[PDB]
């Protein structure tokens, strides 16, 4: 359209929509983080792990940034990295205990 | 300041919200990709058997790099599987500890 009377309000409406759009994305991301966070906390409570291990994992999960999605992503990165480290540590102990018992270990599917 | 000049000002504002909006998505996609690569290299620096690492990498480079909402869900999935595996290994750990007549603590 070309009439000033039509373009201006039309563009105004368009601007209000981009804003509503932008806000929706953020909200949806902050909402996705909230659900993800609670979901992992409940799944964790479902494990047979010792209270001390759970406490330490829940702490890092509960601390994920809930407002900035970019920081949420690095906080998730740090969580995964810490889990991998702990798993690694425990695995070595597992190995030593295996030999100690004259046992063996292998990998399979479930 | 004429009525007609209101039009160029809005368009400029429209473009901004569009760029900012396109940027937001670009940074998220690059962040996902960067932390995906980052983690995969961290995993290689561990002593975990090749199978365990291969198994974890498979799940990592499996993360959705386009849609952030799905990236988040795959991240949760990766995290859930790590927790479950840790839980299983810990249980095998207490079981072996109890046969070697040893004890564990923190």
């Amino acid at each position: 359209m070309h009439s000033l009377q039509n373009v201006i309000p039309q563009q105004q409406a368009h601007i209000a929509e981009l804003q509503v759009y932008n806000n929706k994305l953020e909200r949806d991301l902050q909402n996705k983080i909230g659900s993800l966070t609670s979901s992992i906390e409940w799944y964790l409570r479902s494990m047979e792990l010792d209270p001390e291990i759970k406490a330490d994992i829940e702490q890092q999960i509960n601390s994920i940034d809930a407002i900035n999605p970019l920081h949420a992503f690095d906080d998730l990165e740090s969580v995964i990295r810490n889990l991998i480290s702990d798993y690694d540590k425990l695995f070595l102990m597992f190995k030593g205990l295996i030999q100690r018992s004259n046992y063996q270990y292998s990998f399979g599917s479930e | 300041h004429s009525l007609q000049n209101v039009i160029p000002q809005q368009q400029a504002h429209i473009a901004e919200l569009q760029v900012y909006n396109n940027k937001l998505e670009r940074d998220l996609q690059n962040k996902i990709g960067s932390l995906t690569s980052s983690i995969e290299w961290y995993l290689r620096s561990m002593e975990l058997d090749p199978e365990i690492k291969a198994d974890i990498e498979q799940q990592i480079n499996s993360i959705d790099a386009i849609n952030p909402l799905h990236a988040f869900d795959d991240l949760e999935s990766v995290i859930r599987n790590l927790i479950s595996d840790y839980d299983k290994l810990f249980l095998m750990f207490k079981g072996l500890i109890q046969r070697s007549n040893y004890q564990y603590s923190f």
Binding site: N102, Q104, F107, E110 | K88, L91, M92, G95
Partner: peptide, 27 residues
């Protein structure tokens, strides 16, 4: 494609390579 997970399994080379994973997890 195929719903599954890779797992760690404990074998007893003296029982012929018998899988004692469950037996040991129930301590």
């Amino acid at each position: 494609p195929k719903r599954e997970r890779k797992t760690i399994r404990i074998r007893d080379p003296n029982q012929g390579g018998k899988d004692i994973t469950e037996e040991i997890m129930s301590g």
